Amino acid sequence: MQKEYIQIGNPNVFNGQYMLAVFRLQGEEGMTLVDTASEVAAESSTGSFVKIGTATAFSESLDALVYRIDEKNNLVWIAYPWRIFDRGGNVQNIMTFIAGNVFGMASVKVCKILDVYFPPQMLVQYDGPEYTIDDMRKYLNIQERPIFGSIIKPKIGLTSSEYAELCYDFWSGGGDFVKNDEPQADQDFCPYDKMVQDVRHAMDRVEQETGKTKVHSFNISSSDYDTMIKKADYIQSMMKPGSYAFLVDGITAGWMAIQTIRRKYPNVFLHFHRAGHGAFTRDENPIGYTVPVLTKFARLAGASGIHTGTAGIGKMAGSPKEDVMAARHALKLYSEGDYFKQIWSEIPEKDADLQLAIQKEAEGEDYSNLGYWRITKKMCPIISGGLNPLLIGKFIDTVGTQDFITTMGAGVHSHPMGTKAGATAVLQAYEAWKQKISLEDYAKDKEELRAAIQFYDKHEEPSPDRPV
Amino acid sequence: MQKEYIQIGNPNVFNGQYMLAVFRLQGEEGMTLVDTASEVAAESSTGSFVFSESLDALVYRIDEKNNLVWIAYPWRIFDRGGNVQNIMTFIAGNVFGMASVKVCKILDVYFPPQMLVQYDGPEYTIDDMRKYLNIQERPIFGSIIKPKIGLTSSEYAELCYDFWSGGGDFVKNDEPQADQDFCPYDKMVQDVRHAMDRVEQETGKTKVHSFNISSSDYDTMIKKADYIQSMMKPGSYAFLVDGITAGWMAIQTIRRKYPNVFLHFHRAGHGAFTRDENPIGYTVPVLTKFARLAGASGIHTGTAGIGSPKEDVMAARHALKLYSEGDYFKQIWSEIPEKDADLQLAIQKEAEGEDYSNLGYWRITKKMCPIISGGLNPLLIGKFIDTVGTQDFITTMGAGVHSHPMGTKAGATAVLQAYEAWKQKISLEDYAKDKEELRAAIQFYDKHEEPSPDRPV
Ligand SMILES: [Mg+2]
Ligand SMILES: [Mg+2]
């Protein structure tokens, strides 16, 4: 333990040269919080303090600094000179410093990153998203409303033709979007080449019959990069521009896979499937980093969408706080964590145009007028869990935005009239919400929604939708 | 929940078509273990249940008292192409995000022989690195550089020079050492080569440097790898990949694109999955088994308590051996059927500490070695060898060489001298009567309070 990593009250940490982080931290018995914090700061930056030498100018330092402590609540604030991070906008490298070996120190019994802050100067160095929910709405030729999507059930085991036919049914009923299961890939019983081909053919039929475009999100997570690229290129050759998204298992395949697809296919929606995140993010795990932190780094890395839950809706009990925090970190110009306020722009905070855009955001207006080259573009939540037509209105009112993509399973496929009618019932429920008509009244005219009222009030689902 | 996923006592799970797993599993308060097990089996396989075959994961044993659940995965459900990230997405994915499951820790996994056929395993091993170094039998003695981030390229390379000049074999980049402006990647590679050239010229010995190629994206990682290949002589470099943060795909990509380069799996970040304090995740032995399956040449462990040695010893066995034992499953690292007499003889020979030569290269999973992180030094290396029961490891010492009172070069010499004492069955004190580097070390490392001690990986 070297005391030089402890600089309580250091004014300079807010000067824009530092990424900030809050850790919940607790050392093993006999180690003080400040001693523990020094070791965490050291191992997440320069390792050892060196007074003479190193590459810094005489006036410069690369050490992380503990600048605030709350012993009562086992909290420490650490400032990272972001110059220490790899260039080229490398997000896996940041996570390797702050969320790497520190999680392996047996002397640190609690080590949870609760929040991080990116100064405007740092945001310049990272991609942020490029293709957004606004671009997907444009391809779908819809405005304002959420994008209503589906997972297929059973999630693994259908043949390519069976899988595509349920996509056809959902899209045919007015559904917008279908995702592969997060580990749906090149299983021999549903081979990847045929899966893509059969999805295209199913989508062609819906387009011919309804006149409407649709989107399918393909899992391209693979053994290796060459295979993932071969899948992405194959999909681009098999599907019309806009009609496909790329699903990457960001936690298991890796941060590098997210950034690779963001950069090689910038005009394709990049769907960050966060399967596996719970080991980092769950409340029960004292070592890791929280869902809001994950979401912030996913936006920095350039994901177009990342999953959340249903903000407590449908889920018995369940707090909305975390999902709404994540949705706002994903979507807004101004968002807040538990410890840091975040403006998602390289424009300095004092700028009059920026502050006006922040105020207009509070009034419900998009902030693209600032220039996409001066902001971090929006990433959207992808909603996993037990929504159904009876709950979509309450969910919109709870999350406070329509800028999300649902991925409903039971809430469409268990509809007693079938998946097509199930998708229709969700759209009808949305219309009732928009027009301020009760479900019951709106359904007097509409058998799909009427059937959904009778069914989803009472049905005990044998296999409920699960979290992502 | 669906009962179809509960098949307690099903004898077919042992027929070779299933990957087996043991979870420490507990539902949230108010959920029975059987219901929790059914939901976890479903969400890690077919999702929901709907002519002779089936892809559903099967819960085949439950220990209520100890909150243990045994699950069989038909490995046909996994992606083709030997995709390891896909396996982890099934068994270590959304199940960790199920608030209805308050404990969910994969404790062991079992790979049947015909499953192993589908995966690469390692290609370049510690034995290949020994051949490049022109050594036999002994461990490969390596170092981290300190301060780990902040030195110029020339300063970094000069400490490599000092360590290698003293007899050290191996240096690794820090796990997040990359293209920082103050130590740019291209100059780092150039200056490491210049340093290595001087050592070769002055000692006649070859040396190895492990370069972090973890990057923002695949093209950048490949550019770095190709640059290193153009700048360093074959064998003299290894590729360090931050497997947890860069991802499983990065590991497999380097394994396949550069098969004849040592693939150094730096496990920074694994603690969120593996730590005992975290009820949700998967353990170090499980991580190690999947690292070998994916084809890492080495992966980090600790010092086997040199704390209990059990975990690090188990990791070393899963990494290196033809036959290794987890807490719940015995593992033969071969596609050969278990009844095969040659296979059983080889396992017997290995258990007797004897070399076996009766198998043939293409039907076994090659060895991956531990990379030892923590506070070893000349006083402790013999005790570590004895404790881990193998010499097939790479050390990456920091303070245990760089804090040597005579300097880094002398520190590396002292480690080799300590190894010589161990090999020759001579006490450290007796061997050091003639060896001032070791003598200084023996009198220093038993009392020095290190200002910046080595930390785990
Ligand atoms: Mg899924
Ligand atoms: Mg390190």
Side-chain angles (χ1 to χ4, degrees), chain A residues 101, chain B residues 148 174-175:
Chain A
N101 296 335
Chain B
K148 67 187 198 61
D174 193 26
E175 74 279 345

Side-chain angles (χ1 to χ4, degrees), chain B residues 151 253 432:
Chain B
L151 294 182
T253 292

Side-chain angles (χ1 to χ4, degrees), chain A residues 36-69:
Chain A
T36 307
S38 171
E39 282 289 286
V40 166
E43 186 56 15
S44 61
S45 63
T46 47
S48 294
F49 167 83
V50 169
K51 183 190 154 73
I52 296 166
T54 90
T56 53
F58 186 83
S59 47
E60 293 164 356
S61 180
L62 293 161
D63 304 316
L65 312 180
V66 179
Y67 67 90
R68 175 175 168 191
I69 186 156

Side-chain angles (χ1 to χ4, degrees), chain B residues 148-223:
Chain B
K148 67 187 198 61
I149 296 287
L151 294 182
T152 66
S153 61
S154 78
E155 281 177 312
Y156 175 84
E158 198 65 16
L159 274 167
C160 296
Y161 168 86
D162 292 337
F163 176 73
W164 288 325
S165 288
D169 307 298
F170 174 106
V171 176
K172 57 180 290 300
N173 279 158
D174 193 26
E175 74 279 345
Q177 181 172 3
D179 192 23
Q180 286 89 6
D181 80 278
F182 49 82
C183 184
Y185 202 85
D186 55 341
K187 301 72 164 173
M188 187 259 304
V189 174
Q190 294 162 21
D191 289 346
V192 161
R193 172 66 188 263
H194 287 326
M196 196 181 277
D197 282 347
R198 290 159 53 207
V199 176
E200 284 169 12
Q201 285 147 21
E202 292 165 10
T203 73
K205 296 175 163 113
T206 54
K207 304 290 167 179
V208 175
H209 185 278
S210 187
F211 294 91
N212 178 37
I213 62 173
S214 311
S215 299
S216 58
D217 57 33
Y218 166 60
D219 283 338
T220 298
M221 176 168 71
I222 294 308
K223 177 198 199 143

Side-chain angles (χ1 to χ4, degrees), chain B residues 94-115:
Chain B
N94 294 335
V95 292
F96 295 163
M98 279 172 71
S100 67
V101 188
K102 69 175 287 174
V103 179
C104 186
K105 194 84 163 185
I106 310 176
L107 305 188
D108 207 347
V109 295
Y110 172 73
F111 308 139
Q114 279 313 110
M115 182 177 167

Side-chain angles (χ1 to χ4, degrees), chain B residues 240-396:
Chain B
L240 185 169
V241 177
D242 304 330
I244 299 303
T245 58
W248 287 101
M249 306 181 51
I251 294 294
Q252 301 199 244
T253 292
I254 295 305
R255 165 63 181 75
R256 293 174 173 184
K257 186 151 190 312
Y258 308 92
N260 305 309
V261 182
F262 189 102
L263 173 48
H264 172 173
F265 188 135
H266 198 294
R267 64 178 190 176
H270 76 95
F273 290 114
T274 66
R275 283 285 289 279
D276 294 346
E277 294 91 338
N278 272 8
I280 296 162
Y282 58 78
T283 63
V284 158
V286 173
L287 170 67
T288 302
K289 292 190 80 178
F290 278 112
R292 189 173 178 182
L293 191 70
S297 312
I299 191 163
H300 286 256
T301 71
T303 62
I306 296 298
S308 175
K310 288 174 190 323
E311 182 149 87
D312 284 326
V313 167
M314 184 171 287
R317 304 272 181 282
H318 282 330
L320 290 160
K321 299 191 83 192
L322 173 63
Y323 169 79
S324 62
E325 298 183 338
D327 281 332
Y328 299 95
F329 302 121
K330 300 154 161 75
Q331 182 68 66
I332 301 167
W333 292 92
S334 174
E335 70 182 64
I336 300 165
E338 186 174 349
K339 80 196 280 233
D340 181 276
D342 282 309
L343 181 63
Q344 288 296 323
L345 183 63
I347 292 164
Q348 165 174 18
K349 281 294 173 223
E350 173 178 74
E352 280 158 13
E354 317 214 308
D355 275 342
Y356 62 87
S357 60
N358 61 310
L359 310 183
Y361 295 88
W362 300 105
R363 291 199 89 192
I364 55 70
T365 310
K366 291 172 95 164
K367 69 176 66 175
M368 153 191 97
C369 66
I371 305 172
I372 310 304
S373 294
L376 295 183
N377 66 45
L379 268 169
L380 299 174
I381 180 61
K383 293 170 23 184
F384 178 73
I385 294 164
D386 288 339
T387 296
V388 78
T390 181
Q391 295 181 72
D392 277 349
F393 60 86
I394 304 168
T395 58
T396 54

